[model samples]
Target chain A: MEFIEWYPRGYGVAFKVKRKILEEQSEYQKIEVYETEGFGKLLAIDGTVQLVTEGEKSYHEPLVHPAMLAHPNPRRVLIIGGGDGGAIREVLKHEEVEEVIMVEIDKKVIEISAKYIGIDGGILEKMLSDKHEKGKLIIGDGVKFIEENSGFDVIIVDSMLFSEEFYKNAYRALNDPGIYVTQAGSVYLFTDEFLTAYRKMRKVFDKVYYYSFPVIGYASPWAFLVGVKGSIDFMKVDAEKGKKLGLEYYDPDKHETLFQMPRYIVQML
Target chain B: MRDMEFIEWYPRGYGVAFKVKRKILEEQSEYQKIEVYETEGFGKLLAIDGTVQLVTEGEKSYHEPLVHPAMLAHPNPRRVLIIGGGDGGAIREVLKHEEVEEVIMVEIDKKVIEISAKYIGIDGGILEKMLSDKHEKGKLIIGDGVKFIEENSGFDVIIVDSTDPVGPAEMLFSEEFYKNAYRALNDPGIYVTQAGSVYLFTDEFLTAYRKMRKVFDKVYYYSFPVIGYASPWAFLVGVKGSIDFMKVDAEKGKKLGLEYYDPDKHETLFQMPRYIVQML
Candidate 1:
């Protein structure tokens, strides 16, 4: 028997992996069982899934570092829905950052990570016991946090791109000129999401652009949207603007090149 | 476990199938052997050792055109080495150069040529027939070609026709092997090896290519169609000089009576795909 589960692709990858334990009510696009040679008895999904990849928080650090460092004295930072804690790790990289606020809607995502993840959240576990107000975790809806926060030097939206309502709210909450970084839709994954966000950014931002990452096996690559609240070219980011950022990817050269889209993408824009 | 690259070129989206009986020396790493009804059309060419890169006369194709042009590209084209090509496909074309003296083909198998000569027709057969006299006209040596080049010198042009990074052919993509091919080339000499299919093996392609860019005088990649292997695609051709071959001198090319390669395609092939064009 074969089954497929489809879900609207959100901020990251979407697609259905084979049903694990379908007790909880969930909507899926498609799910199937097939014998892949190496990854036998495998559960493969069609839509892009965020959890498929994570490496040393380059995505998180690049997202966190520049915005926070550009500010002279950024003590508080807010990250919404980068549920992977990689963002939280990056937020905590700054010694000057007095309190890092993270909001995640799905508690199950955190539970899944604590159990199935490779690194076992050793960094998150370490952060939990910090004597200083280094890291703060909020178990609540992401949109609600965006509604309340203000004066955060850096705002990182690791939200699902498919979450249209969530992004509209993020744009409304962004601090002027304070860096706002977000996961726009995949350049390949066709959706009205990016265009909507794009039009919205242009309305609220002086400068709006896109970027990509070299994630190994994801179907649609990731893109970024930076609303230049101030006069900032997000493409020309430097390491000096980031604090204690450790990255295996996301070089400044890659930064300079990432916003340059292929002709096909230009058509999309 | 069948690797797309090892299977050689097929078409754009379609792929080749390989069958193995009784798991005779199962190679799970590169190929998958399973039981199935075997027929001629099903597994037509079991072994596609990337020899005689056949091209239709559509674009005055680059394979034969470039091979010959490469030999002539240099002032004196003599003492050439044809690596990993057991079938004399490349030799048939290389021998066409009157300046080429004493050609040596380091092949890994004799039967490969035997099968190709019989099946693919003598795709330029004068050099593929391996009596010691003929193999000398296109000398055929069987062994690890990387080791051979490492130990030898005075090679003017090395035309490598190995499988799609399959079996021992994978090493040919290694920087060590490329360095060896570079060293073996007589100063003012050149070589071309197959590259591409790293879409399956990502890090290997990036690592080796990053290293290759560091070693060779100029490293550029171009794609060709095979319509018969794992990737249905192939890319090779690297050079050591001013890596430009002025398109077909219609007069010089006319005498060759070549069906599928010319100056227009030469210029056209260098134009990058839209996705790649954006990168540059």
Candidate 2:
């Protein structure tokens, strides 16, 4: 029998997994991994979809590339809660980066993601061995880790519902010319999350720009937030540099297109 | 308990069907079979001839883009005509443009309006209120839109909010209708129609594009995602004059208190995927 579940309560959106590979309870939340008929491998935590292997690039690529290219040189990067290793793997693509520190609050999410997400073509194997020389995994609360760390060039928030206090600390921790980027919830449903974080970040960062793209599996157009400490234009990334990265979703041309904030969203900001 | 039926626009060369909570309505209207159901998360659903038309949750994504881009594209749109949006969702958006002085909506099936007014959930009451208002800004006509286009003139904007090229709506997609639209429009008039899905209904999109371009001076097609519709929905717009829809003023649109459509969103909606571009 298939394991079928509806998401976001009272909403009609539902997904069915053909088979369950792993279903367990972590210290924090319930985690499940499934082999879906259409979307390939799927991972969910607490009844919400974390990632679907069928179009993982659609979610992770836009989440990482625009911010990475916005900074001329990204050397030291911080990731708040990309337990699945999708964000980290994309970061590793840029050979210029020296160190990647991933702070995931739930350890089980990382273990299961690494084991089941073999679809990422050996990125997990490298994370397990000493191969990712610049990358380090610290299993603890992301809020504590980001608050303590100081000199990173780029910070990516892979977790949800981060408090404003954390945003203030993240601003302080960045270098003089730093870029902080993270996924802002869907424009369709998570309007409150997007508006709240955007207003709070404006109080801290010198310049803030956001971009949106379609994630069919997510059931809507997903968005992102990029904050720059200095005067580096996030919209005008180095085109020659970005084209060479071979990103599935983000490209230099989209720098002109994706960041165009819709009118309704602009009114909120 | 019986399993309710849910119809879906499947992948290329196929279709999808599923069971829902319960069947709401199944009646062959004056035009076609108008069906509705109570689904799990998709909310109250409506379909015509075995195809999903709109769901309560996903309606705004399709309607806002359908109406706003053309309305904003024209500098001063006072008179508007909507063809085949009997559900009143499109009319609700049209009435928001304070500059719009008159609206004539021609729907073939009065049953769609009657049934939708009862079950669509969001703007069920707007249909009756539009006609009953004292100022007479809203006009609902139960007849053929193309024939009305042949007889009418001076419309600043014509929105073709009909379904796919099937059933009674088939002739609305013809080249004859495009010529009538051109004759019906004013000097700066713009014609906008819902071309079907780019991923699944490629042929339908190309056909509409070719026919519209044959009549209008400038033609363009844009796309946006509508969940219940299965794939990214594309809209083909033709203008009698040269006007950049992308250059629409943002401040003016924001004044209307829009939920989804915006100036920047309008610009990005025209950025077609390579596969779609190659087809056109």
Candidate 3:
């Protein structure tokens, strides 16, 4: 039941499900995946349970790929926590970076990968790469690490609704010119929560903004909340400008469009 | 392992849950005096049995169309079998097909009838009337549907209107049940079940379609959105080539008097994501 939503424009997508803490199951937390079309699918985590949706991956692309590619020359980029690793595969494509840092809380997730998960091991290889410059896998508190770490130009909190502590650490972690991006909850229904979170980020960073990605498979239109330390005008992620960025959902031209919250949301936020 | 399942229903913006007794898998409190806070709107509904059972506005649109087409498609449809539709809505739909003579309904939850009769009057009243109006002593049994179908087949049209396919409904879609359904319907009898969570589950739907297709002659998918329970949902129709049923034409489908469905939507529901559009 605990999850986050992102609605930038036309569609809304939610990665939600019952996170059951079990007594016998090794990976105590059972994860069910719910998409925005108000549909939920259980994303089985066992090595033998590599279940992929028949739907495409354009959704994860627009949300992560474009943003990952947009940050100019991101060498030591940090991906906070997306256990699925679907987003991380997209991040590996960024040729600009010699290294990438991933901090995830769940170890069973990585174990699912090393065991029989359908994806390539490059991500896991990256997880163990110890390539502090190439890939640094930290199995620790994201909030604490960000609070102590420095020198990254871009930080993507690939997390669901985080606690106040995480945001505070993100504020402290960013280098002078760093930009932060993460998924905020939905725009249409969670208006009050979105506004409160936006205002909180406004206090830490000079600018606070959001964009959406359409993922009808997961009921596509998803929003990614973007916060810049200083005032950095986030241009629409247009296809042409971000061609090299290779986004599945967003384009540079659509950057401003994602910020166009639904009319009612515009009135509130 | 049961994860926390949270659902927010109207009148109560937040969600509520009940821990279970070891004996029953479902919450023992499966039944309640669920008062309906409703009125006539598009697809105006009568909440019954913890689900919206009837919509006075367009009830006939879905009911009549689904039944008549399959009945007319078959040269003659006389003996028919119905499954898990405790509300009698689908049976009401089956009777209207002109040629259907004898129809029998097998539902698991008789309490559904008892509960629905007590509180809801709008469509519930109409449904009760239809049950009496159409019955020439048609058979009504309370039991597990899979066993009923296994015991008897050769039904004209078998319609499964159970809750969802994730739980006991899972058996309804098993290789055995589908084969049972295939045997129960007339040579040309069409079998249809409510599939696809319009709110979610497109991925699981495609998988179900493929598996059921293994059991039947022809398999197709359609959707309808209900504002009350979940906005929209999918219905899977499987038919043997013994019948030559006309595909639902948009122009003809426009007549369904739906709040969400339309002629354009005939193919729109299947419109794939930029990712999976071609898999169709």
Candidate 4:
């Protein structure tokens, strides 16, 4: 009875799970899938929950669409380290996005998730064979890809730990009017870590905004950051944009109310 | 084996457990087994009757959202009633509203207040100074809250802060108590109480929601993260005629130096997940 145990930041606190339907070690990190009592098929990377079948949309929709819809017309998008293709699925929702380039370091993650997770694998097959949509999946280091790539309207970093080179390259890779978004960290538990990331983003982008929502399963208040080259109100994303795109979570009404930073978090940054 | 072990009275069998370095208070109170422990990662934690009641780490997350949304909804909440919040955390938050002329709290046990007042490290000394002025008359009463509410009336807001839905606290979750609470309030009054977790105890949460709806014209359950509570928790609110909690000015609450609850939070508090949504 080897249960999957999760340690967030190696703090004294941790969450333990008693089941794992699938467990494997990729070249990059440890991947495990479990059946929860309530939440549907839970997926973990290095003992941290990346997504779950029941609540995947809550995390992915917010991760991808806010940046995709923020731009006037995001024609080209680049994603760093989203091997699972969940971010790719979200980025492609913008019909205006003609090309998507997903750079992943772990080939096994893409391979395993395609079969077990089913979402990323199926979407990857379509990206390879679909005619009207021209998307590419490059299995390489994320930091190296950002430095080499340029002229992207939207760049979404899916994984944690963006190197100095990663940030500088991201600044150079984006177009003049661009939006960059990422899952920074937990709002309540990791205030200092999230604040550090936000401050780092502020140094490069003209305007940076921080917003948070609770992912009940994660046991923490989740936060996301969007950095813009030009000033943009996320609320300007049309209500019909979500409807036409078949989005479940990223409504413009939610955008209007979702961006209020916690007062304590506001003071730290 | 350690000298002390932290015992969290988590319901639903499987709950979070932490290491206790020291035990501060352990006594059999009039109603329940009250215990306080110095814990790892969660700071000082207070337990009532067995279940975990409050922790110093994430207490603000639960207290702010529970108190502010109801107070900010009412135009001018002069009189307030807090039931079963013996630790004085809810009463302290209610005092943040300058328009609140008086707050009358009914706690079933005086022992909880006495221990909370003594443990300044745990409560930050909120119990003593909140209504210490003799001219302020009295703010706390150690008596039966269910009986007290039947006699009291004309309160602008009623905050139901209690232990888990077991033992002495079980009566507070009944429909009879809600009807009594409705009578205890003015026409515009609102009622709010911790309604369990959306994950661990879905049935109890739905039952609480359904019960609140039967008493008031509008009912909403807002959730927030409490680290020591083992899961995310929600607070159910019943609003009377024409008082929309959504129309509140968060700026008004922000000016009062609130740490967690803000205007944006009040709006999103009612946004339940798909699983909980389908059940509710």
Candidate 5:
């Protein structure tokens, strides 16, 4: 059997599947997992591929590190809609991060991802067993949690389609020198959505920049937008600290050059 | 009738599939199988040996980066040489520089040029211009590029726009070929070739880097995602003498009216991610 995720542009990425691991209908979306022939285990939500076992770091590192390292010192971090624990795992890598709160809407996604994929390799499970001192996992709506929470040094929205109001709420919840980042959709397939998110984030943040890198399963150049809440050089990252993390896809040189958008992508902005 | 799709499997079981509207042309050349298809979204697509070479929709994403970076790195690239760019896209980009006085293109397959001129149009009419003898500055030669480089010299820039490191283009990746290509350049010449995907074909990329490093004084690697290739396409530049690969004339690049490349975008061409750095 084969698993194919079709895009609206009449192109698709296909993977040979060894077998179906599990499928579930969660409160928020349908979740599916499969053992693939080459790409290792696969995770899909509502028929969209979220992460595969082999190259999942390509997606998670770019999503987490750029925003986490951009800030001067990120002590407390908040993640929205990262049920797979990949984002949480990356956020906790920073030694200075004192606390991390992940608000996932679907508890089934968290459970299923932890059980089947285990992208965090039990780090997330260990954190969950501990008290709320260092890490907290809340099964609730991320939009509502941001309204009630504040004083986070970095806020990452792993979901999509942020309104101006949502950006304002995230901005208010952040402390001084805060950083907000979201996974803007693919630049090639979803041009309108990518451009709209950029315009919306620009209105709330002090400075906003978008960087793109190719994800293995995504079949397109995935984009991430970084929003700064204070006057700081967003491109300047702590390479020494990042090197100690032993990251596979992120480093200081990559951070310094990732923001140079191509001309066609820039023309859209 | 069901819709037909074309898939190029890379990295074992993973592949990118394009829904085809119709098969425009197919020819078995002496070198390789050439096929053209009209796709649902990516315009015309060209494939050699069942691998996607280029599509009209995203051709600029591949051709511009492969040609311009090496061309612009040189102070004045007057005489240029292209190996195995029968579709004419490399020549089209090279001719954009007014300083390039002459460009010699050697291709092993003559049928790719004919089929590309009739169906692909990726050459932007340069193949037609060269075929009709209307373009005076571009020279077309049909033969083996591996042997052609051994006989030619004094080229300011030589671009190896061949296919992947297999089939007829296998020798193009050899160290001896790099030595001959290095000898075929002027004192301050630049040599650039299409290295395969850094993610899927990491071994091939590293091997090419090692081989080129043995021949050239300095070697640099850069990459970008071509929508058609379904992966981040990599290119390696072997500099003959010391020159800044990042330096480009912004004024000259602007006049080319390229879609994907410009002076600002050139700054990030060599900025690879951590995994690529660790691999090297």
Candidate 6:
């Protein structure tokens, strides 16, 4: 059997399934996990492929590192909608980071993901055990949490486009000289949404910039938007500090390339 | 009737499917199976041997990067040679350079040109127009590209716009072909060819990179994602003489009205992700 996630633009990506491992309906969406012939384990939420075991780092590293390394010294980070544990894993890599707070609406996603594809063996379970030391996992809506919480150095939303009000709330929640990033949709397939997200973020942040990298199962080059709250240049990352992290997909040199949007994308923006 | 969908399967159970509006043409050439379709969103699509060659909407992302980088890297690209770009997208981009004096295209299959001109229209009918003797600088030859490169010389830039390294196009990636391509170029000549996806076709891509490094003194790899190709498309550049491939003239690039490439993008074009860098 094969699983196909069809994009509204009339093109879709398909993966052959070796076997189905688990299926359950969470309060937010339907989740399924499977073994694939080539791409290791596959995780799908509401029939959309969220992450795969084989190339999960490709998606998570680009999503997390740029925003984290951009800040001079990030101690407290907030992640929204990354129930797969991939985003938080990358965020926790910084020894200087005091705490990482992930607000996922679905608890089943965390349990299922950790059970089936924890990404790095028992890392998620260990983080859960020592929540005060490593991070805190809150089971609630990110949109609601951000409205009440404040003082995070970096706020990362691994979700989609939100209301302009949410950007305003995120802006208020972050400290001065803070960095905010979210997963902008694919620049190739969802140009309208991507452009709209950039415009929305621009209205709230002091400066907004976007970058893209190809994710294997995502069907197009995935994009991320960075919104700065102050005059700091987010493009100048700490390469020496990043090098000590021993990351597989991101470095200071690669970070330099991320902000260089193509001519077409630049023209559109 | 049910709506038909065209699927191009890549390695490891991954594939891209396009919703077909209508099948325009399908035929078996002496080299491979050629097909065309009018799609819903991506415009007209062309496929060779069950693999997608080009779609009208996304053609610029592939053709512009393939032709312009090597063309721009050279100080002066006067006489150019193209191998296996029967669809005419590569030559179209080449002819945009006012400095280009001539472009000789050697395509093995005439059917690809005929079908593409009739249905795909990716070159905006430039292929048919050139064939009708309306354009003076472009030359279209129906022959084997391997033999042509061996006999030709003094080309400022040589672009291998062939299909993936398989079947009829396999010989184009051989080490022997790289040596001949170096011999065919002028002192400051540059050669570039599409090296498949960095994610899916690792072995083939690395082989091409290694072979080119053996022939040319300076070799660099750059890539960008084409919408329909499922992964980031890679290109390998082999320079005959010393020139900074990373340095691109933004003012010159702006004049071309290109969609994908510019000086800013050129800086990052050669910066591969760490995993891909690990492969190298």
> lDDT of each prediction vs. the true structure?
0.50, 0.76, 0.53, 0.72, 0.84, 0.84
For model 5 chain A, give the 10-residue run with minimal summed lDDT: A124-133
Q: What CA RMSD would you report for each candidate?
A: 11.6, 4.4, 13.1, 4.0, 1.5, 1.8
Greater-TM-score candidate between 1 and 6: 6
In candidate 3, what are the lDDT values of residues A249-268, reduced to their tens digit? 44344343344333234445
Candidate 2, which CAPRI tier?
incorrect
In angstroms, the error of model 2 at A185 is: 2.3
Give per-model TM-scores: 0.51, 0.82, 0.45, 0.84, 0.97, 0.96
Model 3 C-alpha lDDT per residue in residues B1-280, reported as the tens digit of each score: 2522222232212111111112111112243223232232322334433444444443543444334444444666678777766555566656655566777777666665544444433333534643455546356776778888889877767777776565446688778888878877776678877764433455656777888889889876644432223323556778865665443444433343323223332333332222222244
Question: B-chain TM-score, every candidate?
Answer: 0.70, 0.93, 0.69, 0.91, 0.96, 0.96
DockQ of candidate 5 (2 decimals): 0.68
Q: After best superposition, candidate 3 residue A194: deviation in angstroms?
A: 2.9
Output the better candidate (4/6) by TM-score.
6
Q: Kindly report which residue stretches of model 1 are placed more than 4 angstroms away from their true locations once superposed.
A: A1-48, A52-74, A115-132, A160-172, A241-244, B1-164, B174-203, B206-215, B218-280
For candidate 1, lDDT tens digit of each residue in B154-187?
Answer: 8778777666565677777777888877777776
Model 1 CA lDDT for position B98? 71
Highest DockQ against the true fold, candidate:
6
Could you tell me how far off, in angstroms, the CA of residue A157 lies in candidate 3 after the best superposition? 1.2
Cand. 5 Cα-lDDT: 0.84
lDDT of 4 by residue, A79-168 (tens): 887777788888877789888888788877777677677666378766434433557878787777776679999988886354445666
lDDT: the better of candidates 1 and 5: 5
Model 2 steric clash pairs:
A11-B41, A12-B41, A12-B42, A263-B262
| Residue ranges of candidate 6 with Cα displaced over 4 Å | A126-132, B129-134
Worst 10 residues of 5 chain B by lDDT: B264-273
lDDT per residue for candidate 5 within B1-280, as digits (tens), equals 2887888888758888888899998899988999999999989889999999888888888889999988877899999999999888889999999998999989889899999998888777789877766888998888999999988899999999999878989999999999999988898989999999867887888999999999998898988777788577788999887777868777788888777765656767765668778878
